[PDB]
């Protein structure tokens, strides 16, 4: 498997709350 840093290091949207900066880069988890 080719390793990519953002596959292993991303920000879940569930901790963004009401901060726009985090909502702009988060990754929603279904």
């Amino acid at each position, epitope marked *: *498997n*080719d*390793f*990519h*840093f*953002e*596959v*292993f*290091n*991303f*920000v*879940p949207c*569930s*901790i963004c709350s009401n*901060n726009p*900066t*985090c909502w702009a*880069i988060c990754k929603r*988890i279904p």
Partner: antibody, heavy 124, light 107 residues
Framework: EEQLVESGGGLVQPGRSLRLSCVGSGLRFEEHAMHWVRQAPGRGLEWVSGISWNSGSVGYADSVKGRFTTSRDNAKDILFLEMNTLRSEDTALYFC?????????????????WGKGTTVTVSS | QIVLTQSPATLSLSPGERATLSCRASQSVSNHLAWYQQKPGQAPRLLIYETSNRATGIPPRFSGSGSGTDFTLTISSLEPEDFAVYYCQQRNNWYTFGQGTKLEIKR
């Protein structure tokens, strides 16, 4: 309370098999990549294996390639390490860990969670 | 994968002095270098992530710098709680730890 709890370690004969589990508690299990890190007595830390949140990407250290298999079942908050044809040199304490960190960009996020470890002893 | 070489193997200093630990990478790890502290009988604890960011609860006497191949962990005035083993860890190409630096009390 976030917690990682390992189990399944113990005394095993060389060439035989073992399976470690790691159960999460207090965290959205599906949301983080997980890792197995081991430490032999009086030695340093060695990354063993890592698996992404949806098991889309798995990696292994060269010292365990072809012998270990890392999987996870998000519906039960559990991570597995299956170890085959074990050798004395895999005698170590085995840590379950989440190690996420990103500063991209202008936002700082990290997650660093370790279990207390389970001990694996490979010997005749 | 990438190999992390740490120096020195052992660092002997007394509390109140400044500690400098180095981490050299065989290949560029960009900025994805973390620093961990471990004491005997305990799980490791994250101090610095992404080269220079301190984790929560980490005093500002810990400082991290560098890029690419070369990285430095600086502890400005040593406290007795800071004597332990330190590992750097890259996350640019999978995950590997350095072999560790032991920071010991000189007397």
């Amino acid at each position: 309370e976030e917690q990682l709890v390992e189990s399944g370690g113990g005394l095993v004969q060389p060439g035989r098999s073992l399976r470690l589990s790691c159960v999460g508690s207090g965290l959205r299990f599906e949301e983080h990549a997980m890792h197995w890190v081991r430490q032999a007595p009086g030695r340093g830390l060695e990354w063993v294996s890592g698996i992404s949140w949806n098991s889309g990407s798995v990696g292994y250290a060269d010292s365990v390639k072809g012998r270990f298999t890392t999987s996870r079942d998000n519906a039960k908050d559990i991570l597995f390490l299956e170890m085959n044809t074990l050798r004395s040199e895999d005698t170590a304490l085995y840590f379950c860990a989440i190690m996420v960190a990103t500063t991209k960009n202008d936002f700082h996020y990290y997650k660093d969670v370790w279990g207390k470890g389970t001990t694996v002893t490979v010997s005749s | 994968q990438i190999v992390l070489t740490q120096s020195p193997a052992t660092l002997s200093l007394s509390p109140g002095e400044r500690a400098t630990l180095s981490c050299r990478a065989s290949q560029s790890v960009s900025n994805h270098l973390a620093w961990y502290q471990q004491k005997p009988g305990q799980a490791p604890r994250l101090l610095i992530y992404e080269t220079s960011n301190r984790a929560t609860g980490i005093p500002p006497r810990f400082s991290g710098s560098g890029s690419g191949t070369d990285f430095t962990l600086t502890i400005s005035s040593l406290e007795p709680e800071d004597f332990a083993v330190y590992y750097c860890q890259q996350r640019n190409n999978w995950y590997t730890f350095g072999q560790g630096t032991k920071l010991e009390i000189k007397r």
